[PDB]
Paper text:
The nitrogenase Fe protein mediates ATP-dependent electron transfer to the nitrogenase MoFe protein during nitrogen fixation, in addition to catalyzing MoFe protein-independent substrate (CO2) reduction and facilitating MoFe protein metallocluster biosynthesis. The Fe protein also catalyzes MoFe protein-independent CO2-to-CO reduction, and participates in the biosynthesis of both the P-cluster and FeMo-cofactor. Unlike most Fe4S4 clusters in metalloproteins which adopt two oxidation states, the Fe protein cluster can span three oxidation states (2+/1+/0). The origins of these unusual properties of the Fe protein cluster are not well understood, but may reflect the solvent accessibility of the cluster and its positioning at the dimer interface.
Numbering used by the authors:
A (entry chain A), B (entry chain A): 1 to 272
């Protein structure tokens, strides 16, 4: 068995930082993990690889002729803790569909046998500002069975969480894609944890962890490292270890109950 | 003549707040303006209409049978200062293409003669986290001749500005779509204005205005109002009046020069 999880959320909310640090903590624990970047920004693996970014499947397929000329051992790269990493890539802006590379990448990984029984976790890091095209494919096509949404007290971040939840509901009759929880990535504001707990309760899920805002994140990322690797003694490292333990132990996977804009506005008014 | 401008930027950066306040200031000045919402969130006109949001062309077409059963005087709604307002709408999450409603809406407005010679400005408020589908159509199909990008010192916001600029370059051989400037919507951080000026200079454009972070914005929006209408004496009202004057007077419209990720990182490092 292997657990297939996807991290969704609005742009800039902390998906890639949270995913890479969570995965580093899982590897520290002894888990075998793959990260699949599904965001055109294509920097979802740089902290595991100590790299600028990673060359994408779309780029390598073009340089090699066809995606069939690629071998899995040519694309997948291992970094901290043995974590295996791949980036989908996507068309340049104003061309085609920004999510088209995700479809190519996930089909390539499936056909080439990247999903070896020895993997314990696969994490997809997915753009969530729109839920369409290749960015909906992990939900539509049953690839990401457990979705975790990174959000914050920001109205736009909570709106995105609600929109992603509507996409999960849309495909509830096929496959087994479910909402696993919300992850609050703090803007260090008062009662922000209580706000995201309230939102989770309204959706029918839970807030799995509250990640504090900590400058050590920037100091680690300037050096192309997770906090787990950069400063294993840091308080923030222990925060990511706590998040990873709670993901491992999580048993609540639900078809969420999206809320109205009036309910969202009332939440914000109440906690402010 | 009428000037056709589009406001792009990452989600949550301040596009709709900035556009509606800028447009209220233009109306206060005596200009005739239309706002076309091109973001699936569909709340781009609520502060002009004093409303929850606005019913969308996609919704009204479905309730009426076809878009041909709609009349322009049925969709367009006027609010503060006579500003005319319309929302595109879009498919539900996980269905189709999130930008498909923009294509329907802009074609409807063109065919029904919404672009009457007496309009002075049209503003499109466009989602910019991906530049594809209907969200690229204002650029691809020559609808938004002057693009203004709302951004901030946030790395993701500057990345989005660079991505939108790449889309402009892609279509530089057809039509006349050009980058008009960057608008800094402050996270009140030190030297943030200098950072966005530097980014504008590297792209070949200018930072047209620095909009401060001001709590009066929230107090106005809780009452479904622009700051221009809510408190015309506010310092922030004068900030939006300054932005509007500089848009009116702007003569620099360029094919931008997108930068590398290394250049972007160096900017952030330098000003921090
Ligand atoms: N908990 C945190 N504390 C401090 N900085 C953070 C935290 N989480 C994310 N960041 C920073 O926020 C920025 C955006 O995070 P990122 O994971 O790249 O967002 P996304 O992948 O959702 O676009 C990065 O500069 C990152 O260092
Ligand atoms: N200059 C500002 N000062 C204070 N709050 C602001 C300012 N600009 C935007 N906001 C707030 O930020 C939030 C997002 O702005 P919005 O215009 O809806 O973003 P977008 O349309 O880009 O998604 C809103 O709650 C708005 O009130
Ligand atoms: S939104 Fe991107 S292509 Fe449909
Ligand atoms: S990204 Fe949305 S449909 Fe192509
Ligand atoms: Mg990311
Ligand atoms: Mg908006």
């Amino acid at each position: 068995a292997m657990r297939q999880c996807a991290i969704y959320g609005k742009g800039g909310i902390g998906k890639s930082t949270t995913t890479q640090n969570l995965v580093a903590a899982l590897a520290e624990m002894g888990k075998k993990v793959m990260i699949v970047g599904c965001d055109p920004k294509a920097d979802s693996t740089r902290l595991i690889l100590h790299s600028k970014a990673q060359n994408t499947i779309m780029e390598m397929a073009a340089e090699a002729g066809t995606v069939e000329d690629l071998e899995l051992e040519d694309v997948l790269k291992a970094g901290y803790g043995g974590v295996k990493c791949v980036e989908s890539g996507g068309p340049e802006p104003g061309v085609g569909c920004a999510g088209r590379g995700v479809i190519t990448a996930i089909n390539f990984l499936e056909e080439e046998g990247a999903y070896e029984d020895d993997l314990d976790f696969v994490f997809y890091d997915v753009l969530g500002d729109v839920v369409c095209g290749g960015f909906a494919m992990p939900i539509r096509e049953n690839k990401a069975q457990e979705i975790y949404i990174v959000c914050s007290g920001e109205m736009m971040a909570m709106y995105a969480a609600n929109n992603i939840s509507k996409g999960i509901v849309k495909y509830a009759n096929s496959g087994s894609v479910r909402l696993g929880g919300l992850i609050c990535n703090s803007r260090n504001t008062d009662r922000e944890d209580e706000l995201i707990i309230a939102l989770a309760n309204k959706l029918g899920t839970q807030m799995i962890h509250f990640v504090p805002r900590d400058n050590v994140v920037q100091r680690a990322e300037i050096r192309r490292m997770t906090v787990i690797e950069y400063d294993p003694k840091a308080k923030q490292a222990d925060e990511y270890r706590a998040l990873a333990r709670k993901v491992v132990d999580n048993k609540l996977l639900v078809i969420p109950n999206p809320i109205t804009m009036d309910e969202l506005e009332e939440l914000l008014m109440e906690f402010g």
